[PDB]
């Protein structure tokens, strides 16, 4: 199990002002550290955050967090469940800031909620340095869904933080799972771009510096979209993305209720998969199966899906080798080309 530590700096808080924190399982003798960012959508105004506080309070508060959590999938310490990094130091960072890990605003006289996701990551890293992270060779910042977008938004800041703190030997890398979204037109016409734009102002949200300099003031929402922020990043980032991610379809107002799919929706879905595949063409480390699903890396059966005969744990291992010219039998760019969900036979059964 991973054990809860609430942040010693209690000014770095979840939405309701309770301390943020992290769950840790150390593996002495390993110099690999996996820091995983939980997902869970976001909220962007007082009214929708108040509703989230009523019925999704664990995503806004640490007051009810359990003392331990079981590491699953890529956070498992069992080689059978985690062929990739089972011996690593494991860190699960709960998502309690509702800001896609972008916020740097405290609760105050003018703010009902604190949005501190970017500062939570920074503070977790700082406190871990005294618990063995100072001796690390690789820090893999991973995350799923909103946490996967959080990786894209924060990996270079973690790298810069460690450089400035005097740890230039720690190699910071990112693993963004299910956080690579398209700002596309809905199938039927709140929306991702508008919600993010409102969120950034409400959260005092921050984006990576090079991306911010490209898009400039008022346009920072662009940096929440993988295909726009990824080319600006310096740290190596492996992108895991279902071609037909359920969250993407949800924001696109697509719901597949078994009934036969007619031409307009068929074309819409096929073009979405084509667009996603296009955005990954120049992402050398990627795993993008043609499945309708959501998230992958912390589920216990994450080992089962394969693209072109290669599983994600294998692809991640090949990526590790590449970061020591392509490797014989050890590919890292794995994007399905077939055009309809479940054309890959290894897709999750749901």
Ligand X SMILES: Cc1ccc(C2=N/C(=C/c3cnn(C)c3)C(=O)O2)cc1C
Q: Is 62 a catalytic residue?
A: no
At closest approach, how far in Å is the CB of 9 from ligand NAG? 4
239 binds, among ligand NAG, ligand X, none (CB under 5 to 8 A by kind): none
At closest approach, how far in Å is the CB of 125 from ligand NAG? 12
Nearer to ligand NAG, 9 or 204 (CB): 9
- In three state form, how does the secondary structure of the chain look? CEEEEECCCCCCECCCCCECEEEEECCCCCCEEEEEECCCCCCCCHHHHHHHHHHCHHHCCCCCCCCEECCCHHHCCCCCCCCCCCCCEEEEECCCCCCCCCECECCECCECCCECHHHHHHHHHHHHHCCCHHHCCEEEEEEECHHHHHHHHHHHHHHHHHHHHCCCCCEEEEEEECCCCCCCCCCCCCCHHHHHHHHHHHHCECCCHHHHHHHCCCCHHHHHCHHHHHHHCCCCEEEECCCEEHHHHHHCCCCCCCCCCCHHHHHHHHHHHHHHHHHCCCCCCEEECCCEECCCCCCCCCCCCEECCEEHHHHHHHHHHHCCCCCCCCCCEEECCCCCCCCCCCCCCC
Nearer to ligand X, 41 or 187 (CB): 41
At closest approach, how far in Å is the CB of 81 from ligand NAG? 35
Of all residues in the shown chain, the one whose CB is closest to ligand NAG is 9
Sites of contact with ligand X (CB under 6 A): 39-41, 100, 145-146, 149, 181, 192, 196, 224, 247, 251, 295
At closest approach, how far in Å is the CB of 250 from ligand NAG? 33
Query: Under the criterion CB under 6 A, does residue 119 sit at the interface with ligand NAG?
Result: yes
Position among 5, 6, 11, 72 found at the interface with ligand NAG (CB under 6 A): 11
- Judged by CB under 6 A, the number of residues near ligand NAG is 4
Catalytic residue among 145, 178, 235, 293: 145
Q: Is 294 a catalytic residue?
A: yes
Q: Which residues bind ligand NAG (CB under 6 A)?
A: 9, 11-12, 119
Active site residues: 145, 245, 294
């Amino acid at each position: 199990d991973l054990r809860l530590h609430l942040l010693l700096n209690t000014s770095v808080t979840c939405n309701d002002g309770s301390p943020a924190g992290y769950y840790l399982k150390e593996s002495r003798g390993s110099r690999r550290w996996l820091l995983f960012l939980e997902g869970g959508w976001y909220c962007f105004n007082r009214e929708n955050c108040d509703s989230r506080y009523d019925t999704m309070r664990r995503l806004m508060s640490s007051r009810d967090w359990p003392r331990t959590r079981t590491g699953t999938g890529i956070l498992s310490s069992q080689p059978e469940e985690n062929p990739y990094w089972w011996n690593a130091n494991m860190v699960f960072i709960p998502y309690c800031s509702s800001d896609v890990w972008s916020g740097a605003s405290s609760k105050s006289e003018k703010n009902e909620y604190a949005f501190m996701g970017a500062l939570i990551i920074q503070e977790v890293v700082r406190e871990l340095l005294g618990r063995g992270l100072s001796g690390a060779k690789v820090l893999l910042l991973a995350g799923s869904s909103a946490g996967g977008t959080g990786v894209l938004l924060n990996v270079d800041r973690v790298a810069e933080q460690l450089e400035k703190l005097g740890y230039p030997a720690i190699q910071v890398r990112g693993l963004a799972d299910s956080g690579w979204f398209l700002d596309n037109k809905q199938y039927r016409h709140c929306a991702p771009t508008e919600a993010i734009r409102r969120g950034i102002r409400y959260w005092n949200g921050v984006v990576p510096e090079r991306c911010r300099r490209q898009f400039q003031e008022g346009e920072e929402w662009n940096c929440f979209f993988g295909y726009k922020v990824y080319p600006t990043l310096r740290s190596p980032v492996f992108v895991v993305q279902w071609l037909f991610d359920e969250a993407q379809l949800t924001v696109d107002n697509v719901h597949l209720t078994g009934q036969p799919v007619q031409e307009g929706l068929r074309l819409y879905i096929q073009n979405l998969g084509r667009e996603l595949r296009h955005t990954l063409k120049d992402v050398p480390a990627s795993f993008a199966p043609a499945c309708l699903s959501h998230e992958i890396i912390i589920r216990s059966h994450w080992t089962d899906v394969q693209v072109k005969g290669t599983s994600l744990p294998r692809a991640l291992h090949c990526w590790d080798r590449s970061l020591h010219t392509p490797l014989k039998g050890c590919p890292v760019h794995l994007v399905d080309s077939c055009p309809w969900p479940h054309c890959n036979p290894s897709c999750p059964t749901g």
